[PDB]
Design a binder for these strands. Structure first.
Lengths: 47, 174, 49, 195
DNA sequence: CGTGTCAGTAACTGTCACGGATGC
DNA sequence: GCATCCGTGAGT
């Protein structure tokens, strides 16, 4: 990973680009389990 | 007909206008968070839409049912899920930021391991890097290298002790 | 339900208001469910009836 | 709608603006602004110049302005919004987590309302709160009163990670803490040479 | 789970210069 | 057409 690249481009992120980035949808609002410290499935910390 | 279905929405809109803004302040005093009070209000009015017995009798007070439902909503929110988490915010001051130690010891150990690996035969070096660096099983290395099972076992057994010999000659702590 | 980016609505100057020639307060009434807005109207059918 | 519903179509909220952006001629409006520019009416000409500045950007770039209305919101990786455990047994999570969680809660409630065929009043009042939640996630406090946390403290939004001296730029890009560095009290040294 | 007399934030302005889009 | 108000900034 060299450090010579000319331009840095910024632009509007399409709602389709958001799905292109995402590795899955965050369905449930839960975070983790407050005993096993394991994150709940489809939560904000889903593995 | 089609007007009977619109009458129900027109019925909901009136109880909105007459009770939602008053229930919001109640839930707000019970919680202290406005964005949560709005959620409470919406869920309460949803349950109102789902219960025709509460919307049936106009001669019976309906605001009180809403207040009781909101109270039993907030008292529920006040249990286990809130109990543990609600306490701290990382953005808020007074919380220690997560720190990770430096890799100095690991880097020095890796350097010494590589040095001791250089002074091994190609076979032993190619065996220990397939059991500890690649984490394969005893039979997987045997299948890969095209050798026997006990062959891999003996090669590991000797190469470990050869690394120990090379390290103890340089004063590596036990 | 679709949502609007607050950077282009509330951020001055309103980019959406500049694109659609809509006033900032009118946009504020539209987005947060205070006033309906006409998306389309069949003018020829209105003339024929 | 009860009378002449066959003749027009109207909508509310953000979906209406989405449809308006869809029913919009970029080139036509750009040239219509240039028409006003060609006739020197300063008072009403500056206000058209500033609109052309925005419209021509969507014209030339080949990028649709539809991106100003979102159908899906991205979620920052968890290690940039970490939830730590405290020595008292309890936990402490970034405000971004609370904002994302409020967004998720209201969105799932809206899904329920859509499935149940709930009255339009409830569905619209729910979409409004979803709009406010996304606005708080991106820049809490920009419109109206900010979302207060425990203790009347305003929650830090995603844009708050880049603002001012405490933002990412002036705090972790312009100035960084470096290794191989020390600090101590200074003392005069007349014996020492200039170098 | 069902919930039906009533029931009202906290906090706070003791910043300000300055420019330009916003609005009567 | 102009007065208003909002949003921007204010040492390491």
């Amino acid at each position: 990973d060299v450090n010579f690249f000319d331009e840095l481009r910024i632009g509007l992120a399409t709602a389709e680009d958001i799905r292109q980035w995402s590795y899955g949808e965050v369905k449930k609002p839960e975070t983790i389990n407050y005993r096993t410290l394991k994150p709940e499935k489809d939560g904000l910390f889903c593995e | 007909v089609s007007g009977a279905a619109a009458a129900e929405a027109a019925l909901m809109r009136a109880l909105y206008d007459e009770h939602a803004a008053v229930l919001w302040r109640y839930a707000l005093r019970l919680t202290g968070d406005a964005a949560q009070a709005e959620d409470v209000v919406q869920e309460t009015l949803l349950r109102a839409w789902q219960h025709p017995e509460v919307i049936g009798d106009t001669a019976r007070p309906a605001r009180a049912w809403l207040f009781t439902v909101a109270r039993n909503m907030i008292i529920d929110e006040r249990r286990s899920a809130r109990f543990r988490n609600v306490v701290g915010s990382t953005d808020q001051s007074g919380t220690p930021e997560q720190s990770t130690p430096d890799e100095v010891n690991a880097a020095l150990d890796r350097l010494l391991i590589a040095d001791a690996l250089a002074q091994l035969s190609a076979e032993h070096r190619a065996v220990i890097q397939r059991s500890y660096y690649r984490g394969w099983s005893t039979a997987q290395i045997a299948t890969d290298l095209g050798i026997a099972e006990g062959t891999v076992k003996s090669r590991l057994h000797y190469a470990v002790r050869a690394l120990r010999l090379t390290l103890q000659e340089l004063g590596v702590t036990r | 339900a679709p949502v609007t980016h607050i950077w282009y609505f509330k951020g001055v100057p309103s980019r959406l208001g500049y694109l659609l020639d809509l006033a900032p307060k009118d946009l504020e009434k539209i987005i947060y469910f205070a006033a309906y807005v006409i998306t389309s109207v069949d003018e020829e059918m209105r003339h024929n009836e | 709608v009860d009378r002449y519903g066959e003749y027009f179509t109207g909508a509310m909220g953000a979906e209406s603006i989405q449809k308006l952006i869809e029913n919009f001629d970029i080139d036509a409006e750009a040239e219509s602004l240039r028409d006003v520019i060609r006739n020197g009416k300063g008072q009403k000409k500056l206000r058209a110049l500033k609109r052309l500045k925005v419209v021509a950007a969507f014209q030339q770039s080949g990028n649709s302005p539809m991106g100003m209305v979102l159908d899906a919101v991205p979620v920052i990786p968890p290690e940039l919004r970490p939830m730590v455990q405290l020595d008292g047994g309890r936990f402490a999570t970034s405000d971004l987590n609370d904002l994302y969680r409020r967004v998720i809660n209201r969105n799932n409630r809206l899904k329920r309302l859509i499935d149940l065929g709930a009255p339009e009043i409830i569905v619209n009042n729910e979409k409004r709160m979803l709009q406010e939640s996304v606005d708080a996630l991106f820049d809490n406090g920009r419109r109206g009163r900010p979302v207060t946390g425990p203790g009347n403290r305003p929650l830090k939004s995603l844009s708050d990670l880049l603002k001012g001296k405490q933002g990412r730029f002036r705090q972790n890009l312009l100035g960084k803490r470096v290794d191989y560095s020390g600090r101590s009290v200074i003392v005069v040294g007349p014996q020492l040479k200039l170098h």
